[PDB]
Amino acid sequence: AAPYPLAHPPRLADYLPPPPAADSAAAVADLGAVLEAQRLRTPEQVRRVRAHDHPEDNVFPFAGDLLGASFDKERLPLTRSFFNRAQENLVEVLMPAKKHFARPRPYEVTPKVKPVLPPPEGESYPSGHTMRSYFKASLLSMLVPEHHDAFFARAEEHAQSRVLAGVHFPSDLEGGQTAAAALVASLLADPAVAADFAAVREELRGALGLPK
């Protein structure tokens, strides 16, 4: 799947604060939550979060229970495509921002932290997962305003799963959240994308039998 040919994608760095400094009463709170989340995470909670991604069409397992079994990857060719292409449009603004900020991971700050997800090497800010999640919720919530509140509580579940897992601090999530925003605005501003997203409102609402 290919990205939408955005003339001007946004440099997330411009839209984000830098992470808390090493001492920054902020830094100790951040690290303190990850270790509190470690203290309190249950064995059923760990095995859940080690479910396994496989992005493929990650929008469907994202909702799919929050929408019907009308929400068919198989029956929604325009929707399916959009989400796959925009996801790529996201990867392209995440990877640079991630690198620019080169933030140490929680476990690269103290081995008292035991990540239960496979633990990448730094670039801990912002949070790509958090970003993919709020990103999807955002676009869905526009298409299906009815379940707005539902999609956003879904994106939270996801986002938080990372602090639990030990691969991100809470402030990493704050970043993913803000960025998701910037990218959505920047993406639907392009009238070629805006066109496709209209066709996807009809496909998906029509598929779900919703009015307007």
From TrEMBL:
GO molecular function: acid phosphatase activity
UniProt xrefs under InterPro entries: Acid_Pase_classA_bac (IPR001011), PAP2/HPO (IPR000326), PAP2/HPO_sf (IPR036938)
Alphabetically ordered keywords of this record: Hydrolase, Signal
Catalytic activity reported: a phosphate monoester + H2O = an alcohol + phosphate
EC number: 3.1.3.2
Domain of life of the native organism: Bacteria
Domain Phosphatidic acid phosphatase type 2/haloperoxidase: 83-188
Signal keyword on record: yes
A Pfam family reported for this protein in Swiss-Prot or TrEMBL: PAP2
Enzyme class (EC, first level): hydrolase
Gene Ontology cellular-component annotations: outer membrane-bounded periplasmic space
UniProt similarity note: Belongs to the class A bacterial acid phosphatase family.
Name used for this protein in its record: Acid phosphatase
Taxonomic classification: Bacteria, Pseudomonadati, Pseudomonadota, Gammaproteobacteria, Pseudomonadales
Gene designation: phoC
